[PDB]
Design a protein around this ligand. Structure first.
Ligand SMILES: [Zn+2]
Length: 402
């Protein structure tokens, strides 16, 4: 069930690379066999002394593993039969149908939920449409907060990469906790009285739907071309921040295709347009991804740091400590170029270059045991600890307005 049958026999490997020859063996592998990179996003993003997580087709696992053995590369099999892990994602004990904050929800469900949560809490939540996807779906934005004059705002989005299902789940949990605890908990009451939070539960709606209907591991948008038969752009390489200069692909068929132009995707244009329009009120930009348990700040497109990088490092350090306090979960943090790898076109860098001084990417659980297939039974714990981190950051921003 749940499309797991399609992944029978597939495996996810973790390979250690220590030098360029190790990396060139994976590159050669990728060039002759169909490899779905999980972490990093692409062969061009692999560094010396790092690990690489990737999914292999059933008919190719022997080949891959024999290359790994022959070249005597250190590796492990993270997942030996992907079918079982795909099916085991759906392990909620929630007894009920329809939306749940402790299940992964289909888009029609999330869409109906955005309307229902706004109707039921009209003093704290309003919904708007900030644009339309390539396929024609309305892109909803929730504004969370008690009405006030000239309020500062925090912008938080989820669902850039279609297969990263824990990210939209987190955006929903945030709204859950806002509604559940406003007026009962003074910190949340003050945060929502003093700030607006714009929460975008799924940006890449077309891709998200696709992961439920046809291709669980799809990540890009679903835009087509009149010429190429390839589909989709990587939304987090599509922003106007050193656009496509490094760590992205110009080939429409690659998973890290930067698009035919900056802001070519209707979805990223809608986001960028909104932030341009609300620039004088937005004081922080937070973008939610998975997996690997990191908190990243600019810059990713370049080996340079912002004026306030020491501030960002201290705030990240304190935030990940707050996060760990609940369930012990360990995050790493730092500037993207050196913590992860240089890559252009990211919304976090773009936002920061627009003058939004607090800009962070969060990569949620886990660290590869399940990867994108993080079970429903971990949604609550993941979201609880993440919520502590977002509250910490928001409270900081309130003390450091500008
Ligand atoms: Zn992502």
């Amino acid at each position: 069930h749940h499309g797991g049958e399609h992944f029978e026999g597939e495996k996810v490997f973790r390979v250690n690379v220590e030098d360029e020859n190790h990396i060139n063996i994976i590159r050669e592998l990728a060039s002759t066999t169909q490899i779905d990179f999980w972490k990093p996003d692409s062969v061009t993003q692999i560094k010396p002394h790092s690990t690489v997580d990737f999914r292999v087709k059933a008919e190719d696992t022997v080949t891959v593993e024999n290359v790994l053995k022959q070249n005597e590369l250190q590796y492990k099999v993270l997942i030996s039969n992907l079918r079982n892990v795909v099916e085991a994602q759906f392990d909620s004990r929630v007894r009920a149908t329809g939306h749940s904050y402790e299940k992964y929800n289909k888009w029609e469900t999330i869409e109906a939920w955005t309307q229902q949560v706004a109707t039921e809490n009209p003093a704290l939540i309003s919904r708007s449409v900030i644009g339309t996807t390539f396929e024609g779906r309305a892109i909803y934005l929730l504004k969370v907060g008690k009405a006030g004059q000239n309020k500062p705002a925090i912008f938080m989005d989820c669902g850039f990469h279609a297969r990263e299902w824990i990210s939209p789940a987190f955006c929903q949990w945030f709204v859950r906790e806002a509604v559940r605890t406003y007026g009962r908990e003074i910190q949340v009451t003050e945060l929502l009285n003093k700030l607006d939070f714009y929460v975008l539960p799924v940006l890449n709606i077309d891709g998200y739907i696709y992961t439920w209907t046809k291709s669980r591991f799809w990540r890009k948008t679903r835009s087509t071309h009149t010429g190429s038969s390839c589909i989709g752009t990587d939304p987090n390489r599509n922003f106007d921040a050193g656009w496509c200069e490094i760590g992205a692909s110009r080939n429409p068929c690659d998973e890290t295709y930067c698009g035919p132009a900056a802001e070519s995707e209707k979805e990223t244009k809608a986001l960028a347009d909104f932030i341009r329009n609300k620039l004088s009120s937005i004081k922080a930009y937070l973008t939610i991804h998975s997996y690997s348990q990191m908190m990243i700040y600019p810059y990713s497109y370049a080996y340079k740091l912002g004026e306030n990088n020491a501030e960002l490092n201290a705030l990240a350090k304190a935030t990940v400590k707050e996060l760990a306090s609940l369930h012990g979960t360990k995050y790493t943090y730092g500037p993207g170029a050196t913590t992860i790898y240089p890559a252009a076109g990211g919304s976090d860098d773009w936002a920061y270059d627009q003058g939004i001084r607090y800009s962070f990417t969060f990569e949620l659980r886990d660290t590869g045991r399940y990867g994108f297939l993080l079970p429903e039974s971990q949604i609550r714990a993941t979201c609880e600890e993440t919520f502590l981190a977002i509250k910490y950051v928001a409270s900081y921003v309130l003390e450091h307005l500008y």
